[PDB]
Write a protein that binds this ligand. Structure first.
Ligand SMILES: Cc1c(CP(=O)(O)O)c2ccc(Br)cc2n(CC2CCCC2)c1=O
Ligand SMILES: Cc1c(CP(=O)(O)O)c2ccc(Br)cc2n(CC2CCCC2)c1=O
Ligand SMILES: [Zn+2]
Ligand SMILES: [Zn+2]
Length: 229
């Protein structure tokens, strides 16, 4: 069930996993949802993606304090756009360790964003070098190649059926790939399929802006990306 907390929505997806949802009223597009994850592991919480704003991200922290009451060990963000990185300063104000793709931390200031404190590096084949992602527990992090943005990264949650492509992936009903302003049109299709190949056992694909979808979301996305080349 959708749990309301100030202006945000939280939905439990699995015993240790919640989706956080924040909204931006965007003229001509309506109220736009943005989703991230909250993962409980041991006696701590891990956050995937900020909300659109610092104020909303602070509300994520207030919800975690009230409903879970365990420390937030770290946050990782999936790309340097406002919907996923717009609340980075709220995390730093709360003393949370933050992580992003090295490329995201390089891009962040020009994107009007605050960089994460820690940079991730990726093996040639896209899996995060674990030494750059300490204490990530069940959070498995994978750079699929450039797509929605050059810096986009993806996460799977070990011990669940859940993976999250962020804005790389569109749901199975999408009428476009959306914002291609920062997209790599050459590599998009390959990166979407690489995400599917990295997390072959994931049946619940958490969507960046809509309800969770099946693996049809990944195939629909790569098929739309094929038309970009
Ligand atoms: C969720 C969503 C996005 C965000 P993303 O870049 O991650 O795909 C989006 C982006 C650009 C355009 Br142009 C339309 C979009 N739409 C459709 C609009 C919302 C309803 C009217 C069209 C999205 O839903
Ligand atoms: C940066 C940006 C986002 C965030 P992301 O691309 O990460 O989803 C966005 C998201 C939803 C909608 Br609906 C429009 C959006 N717009 C404006 C549209 C982009 C193409 C024309 C307008 C964003 O700029
Ligand atoms: Zn984006
Ligand atoms: Zn998006």
């Amino acid at each position: 069930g959708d749990q309301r907390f100030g202006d945000l929505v939280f939905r439990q997806l699995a015993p240790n996993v919640w989706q956080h949802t924040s909204y931006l009223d965007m003229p001509g597009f309506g109220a736009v949802a943005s989703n991230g994850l909250i993962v409980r592991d041991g006696g701590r919480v891990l956050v995937v993606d900020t909300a659109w704003t610092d104020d909303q991200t602070a509300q994520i922290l207030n919800w975690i304090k009230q409903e879970i009451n365990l420390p937030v060990a770290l946050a990782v963000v999936t790309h340097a756009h406002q919907d996923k990185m717009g609340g980075m300063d709220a995390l730093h104000a709360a003393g949370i360790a933050t992580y992003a793709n090295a490329l995201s931390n390089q891009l962040a200031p020009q994107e009007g964003m605050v960089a994460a404190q820690h940079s991730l590096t990726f093996a040639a084949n896209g899996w995060v070098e674990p030494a750059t992602a300490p204490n990530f527990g069940p959070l498995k992090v994978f750079y699929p190649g450039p797509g929605h943005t050059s810096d986009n990264i993806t996460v799977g949650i070990d011990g669940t059926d859940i993976a999250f492509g962020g804005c790389l992936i569109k749901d199975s009903k999408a009428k476009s790939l959306g914002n291609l302003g920062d997209a790599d049109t050459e590599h998009y299709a390959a990166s979407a399929r690489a995400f599917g190949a990295a997390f072959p056992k994931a049946s619940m694909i958490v969507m960046s802006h809509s309800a969770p979808d099946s693996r049809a979301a990944i195939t629909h996305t790569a098929r739309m990306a094929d038309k970009l080349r």
